Nucleic acid binder design. Structure first.
Ligand SMILES: COc1ccc2nccc(-n3cc(CCNCc4ccc5c(c4)NC(=O)CS5)nn3)c2n1
Lengths: 187, 487, 487, 186
DNA sequence: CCGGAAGGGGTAATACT
DNA sequence: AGTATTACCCCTTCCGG
């Protein structure tokens, strides 16, 4: 029971595996062409993913992309989360350099925080720094981000959980005013 | 490896996306009334010559230019924006002249990019009037290969004539369309009364414009919503369709809906009334049919039961259905790059200021060009009065550079006009050509004097703005559609 | 209303569709070696300026020019053809230089039109060399607005160098790629022995080319299929991938397939092997892995159980999997708009006549241009010796037309040369520029003599064709990839 | 019980109804905007319809588009065909003037001939004279959608047997027979 | 499964009434 | 829920061998 579009690695143990999450088949092809297939897995998405913070649990558990993400990860959600099942000990979100890539990264981070908080607090989530990733061919894409020896990744970390969920709520919740004030003062 | 805090990256990325979506995705520009996608599409179509003089060009080509040079986004967004700009029911004054299947007011989608062909309209030519004369600022695009305008010259008030509804992050804007003649009257008042304070100009422009004018026509009931919108920016214009009763041979009466309020989705209204009849909320209605066609326009026939009156069915339609709804107008627009809620007087003043700046920049560019032309013509005529000596020197000179030095020494000439003298054609030596040269120098000097006078006097440029906008309105003016009535 | 017979309408419509698909959809042209879509994409990249001198351009833009101007079909088909032209594993000599994700030999799809940007290649410039010099014919496009070439100049044998397999109605063609050096030798023999008969030409060209050369390399076992293809057009070239045996530190062995036959889909061969192992047809293989990467190329490693012989497993793979396949060569191509099967000598001869007529047309056009330039320069020189008379006559002329008539009278000049001396710059009045005028007149006369000489002697034309082909092949030559071996 | 893509008319009696079959939703919208909705129905398609003569019956009836055509027509196929239903007494196959339009028209004609022979025999099939998405409502109505001014080609049978031979050689699986046919009739 | 062709649907964020 | 900008994608046919 694995997602159909996932391209897995040849590594057996999870300790030396990587799951690169991309937001399209056009970027996924470039990523998988120029990857270390023995260690690195490519999971393509459909672009904008559902908002976990602005929807009910049934719908966010009905949407296809989040199902694919949790099946590729293999773990549980909320209380039934189990770290020992984790298929990849490194989930790298590799989005495009435009603002829409940042929006998709925010949506995915919100989903992970509200559903796989452990994954985040154990320091198992990374962000990659590559107008899109479908314009990059195999060689330089491998050279910058897919080469483990030279690549640089930003590891998501938690300083205070309380401020974390407070910011997540006022930024992804339904309270528009809150975020109006926030963006007005902090832009 | 370097860590990043979850909250810091979260806020950052979301604030960057939000600021981008606010400034350059959905909110209109107060000076031009256009979103960046519309601006880029219009400029590409103009630069590509798709203009009313020329024939139409495939929309796929124009979308590809917008994508390759200007807009680094999906083709579907650019195409749907173009189709919306080419939609009579969505725009009071359409900016694009389209051909093909550009949609329907109901649920029909527009044809594909390879089936529809779009050119510009005369309104779009006033939109892009004298853009190449350094009227507006230009910036490099994303890859820096080409240049695109930050704003269009906007010789007519697009933001109020067509309105702009857009959803952004944290805020949404909804400006209703107006009539061009009322806008002209308001801007004329603002130009003549350029020293008026905010309250006086607000009262004057509220007197000048009756209210929003929608392409769908219909009716507006009441005035409190329109007044609140024009005085604060946040209002609720309660709009309603048009109904009429028709008598049949057997005595049956039917309500004939010929107009619907703004942004009401056709063929969804019909399903809604059918569902309300089925489950039961709109008792009194027996049959519903759409006689709407291409040749007769929107015409919905509601055949009601015998134990029913026209007034009660009409009131039930108003209260329960979309035959009557509200336009939640919010006048949010981008000024100096930031979002602000603006009343009508602020919009008129900003448009007038933009027009004055554009006229001043155009006059400065024309004056510079005339100065260069006059300088070249002066050097050329100074060479002409010594034609025999100049010809002798050009003959005896070994090469071109020695001739340049000789001419410069002979006629106190600077290298630019000497270079022009070398390029001087032989056919220019005919007496008529020399006389034309003298008279052209005189005319260019007169134009320089006139342009200097215009630059000196602001009343002159205000007069130019008034005259050009009056010319635009008279040639592209139309009568008001929606009739404002009382409660 | 008119009654229509079912069979007549069916036959007419299907005949029209079939003829269109044969002549102008899938069957390559013998002279150009390209299908109409490829020709149109190439000419669109050329006319729009997407050439190796400058940087790349978005593929969406090029598809848009092709669709709007030349190719009135879906953008997906045009983009797929462009990507195939930019594919190394699909074309022996790629015609488009692409950037982005143009696919993989396996099941990976190419990136979208808005992500890949493509320009031409130097070989594509040899394809479109001197097209503007009336070398090739031109026709109006589908809507009759612009002109497009029926055939590209094709300065090298693209049809045989890259091959063109395509499915049509009633017929399907398949032509394998070859090596540029061997084709050069064959065409050189054809040019030198221009009077040879069909049999001797066929024997010589068969001697010149060992066999088809595929971009994927590999092996060709036997020669009966290749020989029968070259003498009849219908053959069967058995390709076989490269298989090697390696040992392991534990004593295990694993077969490494580093090369596969032509048109064999990767990532489907591997799943085919896996399914055959699961059901059980190739007993002996224990595990399958794809060590293939961007830095090592194709590498399929299948490790074998202890109680098996590498040779028997290799033969099992050859017999049951896609490791060994056959090319059903069908040398079918379009000659003067007709589908015909051709042996190799026919292809060489057709390319030879194409090159000859292209050279003749180019030289005729150059001769006409040089004669016009010589006429202008002769007029300018003959007006130049009467310089003071001409200047004095132009001065006394009230109007340019009077000066023109006076020059006609004074020098016995025609209209066009009189215009030429009228528009003559003052820089030409200098002594050095007059000397340069006379010098270039002499050089242009010498060029006219040389071009008339080229028109006179067909041996000269054959020589020019040979030298251009040799220069092209030296510029863009490569070693042979596939090794032809015995059974 | 009717296809979702079908844009039905408002008439009830089949005698004054007619179904315009188009090969695209863009052409479908263009035609529906410029039609007489009281009498004319619009049925869009998805491009090339399956080849009935080159496929098995189960695979043919599995295909969605042919099922939509059958259900919109309302009638059965083969022996159970009953002309009583015929939701529309006028089935106008409306395709573009390019070669692909002619191919789609031939495919639909062979499908109707194999599955609805009495439909074609009764003269209830018509051919139009118009890409179609480049036409708006106005000229579409003026040229071929206005009943009072339009002209249509009504499909008719003269000899059934020759029609069967022609259909078999053109749409069957005998490649060399159609090779000879297209070479002779080019 | 191969090379051109026909045609097209469907999720998601974003506020506000 | 629908309004307008955006992210993003799959899946049937025909046509020979
Ligand atoms: C229907 O279900 C699905 C499922 C998945 C899908 N995945 C991708 C695309 C899908 N569809 C796209 C389209 C419309 C075709 N586009 C017309 C066009 C014309 C010119 C150009 C152009 C595009 N693009 C440029 O960049 C410049 S030129 N219909 N479906 C699709 N559809």
């Amino acid at each position: 029971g694995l997602p159909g579009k996932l391209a897995d690695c040849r590594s057996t143990d999870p300790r030396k595996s990587e799951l690169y999450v991309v937001e399209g088949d056009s970027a996924g092809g470039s990523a998988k062409s120029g990857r270390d297939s023995m260690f690195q897995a490519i999971l393509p998405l459909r672009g904008k993913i559902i908002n976990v913070e602005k929807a009910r649990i049934d719908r966010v558990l009905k949407n296809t992309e989040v199902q694919a993400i949790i099946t590729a990860l293999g773990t549980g959600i909320h209380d039934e989360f189990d770290i020992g099942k984790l298929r990849y000990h490194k989930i790298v979100l590799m989005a495009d350099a435009d603002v829409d890539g940042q929006h998709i990264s925010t949506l995915l981070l919100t989903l992970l925080f509200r559903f796989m908080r452990p994954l985040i607090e154990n320091g198992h989530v990374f962000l990659a720094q590559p107008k899109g990733l479908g314009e990059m061919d195999a060689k330089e894409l491998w050279e910058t981000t897919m080469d483990p020896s030279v690549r640089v990744l930003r590891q998501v970390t938690l300083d205070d959980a309380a401020a974390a969920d407070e910011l997540f709520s006022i930024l992804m919740g339904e309270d528009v005013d809150a975020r109006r004030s926030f963006i007005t003062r902090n832009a | 490896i370097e860590p990043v805090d979850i909250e810091q990256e979260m806020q950052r990325s979301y604030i960057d996306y939000a600021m981008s979506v606010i400034v350059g995705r959905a909110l209109p520009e107060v000076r031009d009334g256009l979103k960046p996608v519309h601006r880029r599409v219009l400029y590409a179509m103009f630069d590509s010559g798709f203009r009313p003089d020329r024939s139409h060009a495939k929309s796929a080509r124009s979308v590809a230019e917008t994508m390759g040079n200007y807009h680094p986004h999906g083709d579907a967004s650019i195409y749907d924006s173009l189709v919306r700009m080419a939609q009579p029911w969505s725009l009071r004054y359409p900016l694009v002249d389209g051909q093909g299947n550009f949609g329907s007011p109901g649920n029909d989608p527009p044809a594909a990019m390879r089936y529809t062909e779009a050119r510009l309209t005369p309104l779009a030519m006033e939109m892009l009037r004298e853009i190449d004369e350094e009227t507006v600022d230009f910036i490099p695009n994303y890859d820096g290969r080409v240049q695109e305008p930050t704003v269009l010259p906007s010789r007519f008030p697009n933001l109020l004539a067509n309105g702009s509804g857009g959803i952004a992050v944290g805020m949404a804007t909804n400006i209703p369309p107006h009539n061009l003649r009322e806008l002209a009257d308001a801007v004329f008042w603002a130009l003549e009364n350029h020293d008026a304070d905010e309250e006086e100009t607000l009262a004057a422009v509220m007197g000048r414009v009756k209210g929003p004018d929608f392409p769908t026509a219909g009716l507006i009931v009441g005035s409190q919503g329109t007044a609140d919108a024009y005085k604060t920016g946040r209002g609720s214009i309660r709009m309603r369709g048009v109904v009429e009763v028709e008598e049949d041979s057997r005595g049956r009466t039917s309500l004939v809906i010929t107009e619907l309020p703004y942004q009401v989705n056709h063929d969804n209204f019909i399903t809604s009334i059918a569902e309300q009849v089925r489950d039961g909320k709109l008792a009194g209605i027996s049959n519903i049919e759409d006689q709407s066609s291409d040749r007769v326009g929107l015409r919905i026939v509601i055949e009601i039961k015998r134990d029913a009156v026209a007034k009660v069915v009409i009131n039930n339609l108003y209260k329960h259905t979309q035959l009557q709804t509200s336009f939640g107008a919010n006048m949010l627009a981008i000024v100096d790059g930031v979002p602000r809620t603006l009343r009508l007087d602020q919009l008129i003043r900003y448009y007038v200021d933009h027009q004055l700046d554009v006229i001043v920049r155009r006059t400065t560019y024309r004056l510079r060009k005339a100065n260069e032309r006059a300088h070249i013509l002066r050097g050329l005529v100074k060479a002409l009065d010594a034609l025999d000596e100049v010809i002798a020197l050009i003959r005896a000179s070994e090469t071109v550079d020695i001739a340049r030095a000789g001419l410069i020494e002979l006629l106190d000439i600077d290298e630019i006009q000497a270079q022009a003298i070398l390029d001087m054609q032989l056919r220019r030596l005919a007496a008529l050509e020399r006389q034309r040269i003298i008279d052209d120098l005189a005319k260019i000097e007169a134009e320089i004097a006139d342009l200097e006078d215009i630059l000196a006097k602001p009343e002159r440029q205000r007069g130019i703005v008034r005259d050009e906008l009056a010319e635009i309105v008279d040639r592209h003016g139309d009568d008001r559609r929606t009739r404002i009535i009382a409660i």
